[model samples]
Target: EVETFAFQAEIAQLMSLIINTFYSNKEIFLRELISNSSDALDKIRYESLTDPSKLDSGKELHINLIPNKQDRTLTIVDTGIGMTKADLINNLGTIAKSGTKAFMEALQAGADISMIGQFGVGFYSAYLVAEKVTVITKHNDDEQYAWESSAGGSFTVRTDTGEPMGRGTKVILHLKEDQTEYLEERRIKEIVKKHSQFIGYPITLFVEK
Candidate 1:
């Protein structure tokens, strides 16, 4: 069982508002998150060019989807620029990230609703399908950490003693009954083809068969 922490007042309100607006378009969750993962990987790819040691000294940029029928879960893993505990709190638990409010205003003002990639809080969109979300990540400059939440106004972060990711992030989504459509390879393929084929890195899925 994971511990918890409350979201900042502004973040809580923002989460509520955004989730409500995206209620009818839940499938966009995958696209938005996959896009985020791509951006992370790209950051590391670019950084390593200047430093030459951000990754495992290997150019392994990719995304993975592992579905577990027994747990009703879908794990999206990526070899990307992973975050530290502070980064997790700063990125997810607060609206302090610059342009967060500006982007939300754009959404409410009906400024190209499909531009989810413009928002910093795109990870919250995962709540549209998951009952619970867990982010396990490892950073080259920091210790491994875990962030977990039930997709509400609160979340928790702590040191992770689990299997090492070696590098990057693993987002585990505990799917909802109505959102199980995403737990299939065919459904995920169509969603990716329609929304994420343009992503920079290759995306792969491990089927449960």
Candidate 2:
């Protein structure tokens, strides 16, 4: 049985710093998350090539952005390697495996921490401008789970009751009042092309007023 874990206080503080200070441009959020989605898709595709059976269970790799102007919500959906319940807690709830210790060591040795590729806390980047974040994910190996967080001290995870959307994950960001620039199609397209044009998967932007 897999046990759940929580983020250490320092980890939370690190997340706050990265979300607030590390990335200066607000438009970069789309780039960061889309880059992550592309990485996930690449991982599955690489695995599927060797084991064709993996592709048999719906292995389409694509990224879709759905923006709702009325509600100020932007959803980035990807059909890739979905996370199991255990994976949700381990990957999202905790930050033990991040190379933070090594990063600190490198900083102490005069190495630039900016050059490191730390990813454990990357998901929290959504909290930068989101009042609330709702993740609806379905794994091929387990039932779907809904994870919600407001970047408060805690988060909620529950069995998702929505219709299954095959094997993939969808992250919906309920934008804050001041962060509605993400709701524009032109802005989203620019971000996608700037950061993810070389990504192997097809990226689609859906605008729904």
Candidate 3:
């Protein structure tokens, strides 16, 4: 069955301030996303150390970037730990990164939204650039599935049912009108070099000659 969740009163209020933080520094979205990918990659690497199945041929770790100006979309794919169905709901639906209760605690303090940043709410920063976001993930033990939302509070999590990538996550950002700058190679490279250059995994940008 499908599930629906409110963004939460606490988040509904603080989220704007949080999102504005992303907008104020638009490049932050890329850094946070690429940062998230590195974390995911770390997860699989640490887990697969004991279970070699997770890395069938040993190790092939990398992040692929596909910028489609024609479609006005930016796709970021990683070979790392993918999310399951429940993970999609919790992580994408409500405030799963940092629990809503904690967010409330920080918000009520009248200090700032900075404290809640530790809970991994960083993933949602993607919405700042994309009018729509689609996440395609497949865990080793679970069937492939997808999570999609316009960042409109309600999101759908259903079976991938199509060709699966085996493992890791794919975040497709449908860039907003003014955000199309992200679809450019120079911009993407600039962001990566500045923000994600030190990231552990290899980040490769795909472009035609």
Candidate 4:
């Protein structure tokens, strides 16, 4: 059974603000997303030091950027500390209350809110260039689950029945027509160089010629 929930009030406002007028450089959505993936990778690495079994599954710490022009989607997958069903709702559904104060201040002061990634609401940036977003995550100790939203004020979560991803999270952005440039291998590589070149894990982009 799928569960549906309303976005916390501040998150709903933030999504609308982001999709409507927050970012002038919408392409940075890729950077914000990759940063989040890097954080997840960092988490599992730290946790594994105390429990070797965490790495026993044998998936390496890495990130993959896949652009599918045919489907009009850009997918970012990472082999990292994936989220359980509860983590999905907690981490993505609501922004930390303390962080909302800073976000509210930035908006009022006309400050650069692009640093929003630090607040954990950066994931919402995907809506700036996507009509719909889908996340399939598999945690080592929980059943795989999928989370999806169009940023229409609410989202859904359900146990995923598809082939299991060995581990980590997969984020697929159903790109808006105007954002098609992101679907090119050249554009993706350029973005990675500018923003995530120093990321600790290996980052690969799928190329189709």
* Candidate number of the best lDDT: 4
Per-residue lDDT for 1-209 in model 2, tens only?
Answer: 22224555655555555555544466656766777687767767888888877666586789999999887899999988777887676654335455555554655687542433353445666766688888888766788898877664556778888878687788899999988888987888888878678877888888674
Clashes of each: 0, 0, 0, 0
The weakest ten consecutive residues by lDDT in model 1 span 91-100
TM-score, one value per model: 0.89, 0.82, 0.83, 0.94
Give me the runs in candidate 4 sitting further than 4 Å from their true place. 93-95
Model 4 scores worst on lDDT over the 10 consecutive residues at 91-100
Superior candidate under TM-score, 1 versus 2: 1
On residues 14-77, what C-alpha lDDT tens digit does candidate 4 reach at each position? Answer: 7778878846788789998898899888988998989978976554999999999889999999
Global lDDT scores for all candidate models: 0.80, 0.71, 0.74, 0.84
Per-residue CA lDDT of candidate 3, range 19-138, in tens? Answer: 555335666777877878888899889988898787873377889999998888999999888887877766643355356566557666773443343555767667678878888987
Candidate order (TM-score): 4, 1, 3, 2
Name the TM-score of candidate 2: 0.82
- Model 3 residue runs over 4 Å out of place are 1-22, 92-117
**RMSD after CA superposition, every candidate:** 2.4, 3.7, 3.3, 1.6
Q: Candidate 3 — worst ten consecutive residues by lDDT sum?
A: 111-120
Q: What lDDT does candidate 1 reach at residue 4?
A: 73
- Between candidates 1 and 3, the TM-score winner: 1
